[PDB]
Amino acid sequence: QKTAEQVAAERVARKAEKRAAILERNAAYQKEYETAERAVIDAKREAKANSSYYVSAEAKLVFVVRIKGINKIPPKPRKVLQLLRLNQINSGTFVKVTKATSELLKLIEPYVAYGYPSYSTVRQLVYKRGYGKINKQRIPLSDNSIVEANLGNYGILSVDDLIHEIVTVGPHFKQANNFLWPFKLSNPSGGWGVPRKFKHFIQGGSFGNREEFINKLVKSMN
């Protein structure tokens, strides 16, 4: 009633402090990605001069997409799709790559297409089709006040800070990835680049591992 009018001036001043903290952190994460790309490119040139071959580090993060629809799916691969949250046709997640998680993908390889994303495709998915799980309830990520309220205990005080954990694969990937609701994608705008969809990427079809070409397929669906 009274003094709550004066709080309108006060409460705005504390959010001006938080925006400065977001700006400096976003500048720091920009400096991490630019140095990461330049260090790998120059390291190849270092090795090539000394009659040696630089082998790149294996992918720490992989993105999966449900290709096959429902019904006529055996029980063992149907159970694994249920664990990876690909219940509907055209669904995303992100998977932290380990030896254990790789064996799950072997079981369900006919029904999914997957590959290694980059800091570009991940940025578009979290903005355009990003949704958070907040006491059940598929709630959108419109403002960054929502992300701080739930995931304030593990750092992650912004939308880009959540993106940082997914790309770099930090210590709180398990909490941050489970917070996100699976990405309900549309069908691709151009197409699949094939006559038939169920034959494996290397023979002709769509499913299985495609490494670098998953980035092209998702941006059309995004």
């Binding site: 009659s51 082998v55 580090a57 380990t98 030896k99 254990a100």
Partner: protein, 158 residues
Amino acid sequence: GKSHGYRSRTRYMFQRDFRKHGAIALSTYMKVYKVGDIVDIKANGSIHKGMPHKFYQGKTGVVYNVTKSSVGIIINKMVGNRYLEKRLNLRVEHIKHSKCRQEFLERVKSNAAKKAEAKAQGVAVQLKRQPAQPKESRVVSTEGNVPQTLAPVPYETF
């Protein structure tokens, strides 16, 4: 008529071994069993008393009772759509110790040492088991290790 005896379809299971017939070594009898130990079951063709039914070959269970020549072992089995508790009474000749629990006790002592040691020095332990991670980047030297150019061979008749 159909045959459903006690030792039905037990031609190879209770068959003894190749060059291990006759008497049993004395270490089988010397082993101790307290109420709590986990044990795997193996039937022995020579010893006919206190012999297990074919279903329990390769099963594992906890000991609940001990007596003169035998040990009581409870085994859970599947039937219909519901697990049931069952009580067996097998002699010492069939039973041996399980090595599954063995590795767990090694992990308990090592974690206690790492927590006690590192807290007065390191201030960082990392005691949860890590799954097999992917590779890190490296450089391979080609000095005295030049790549050998291969090619697919043509077809021949042996």
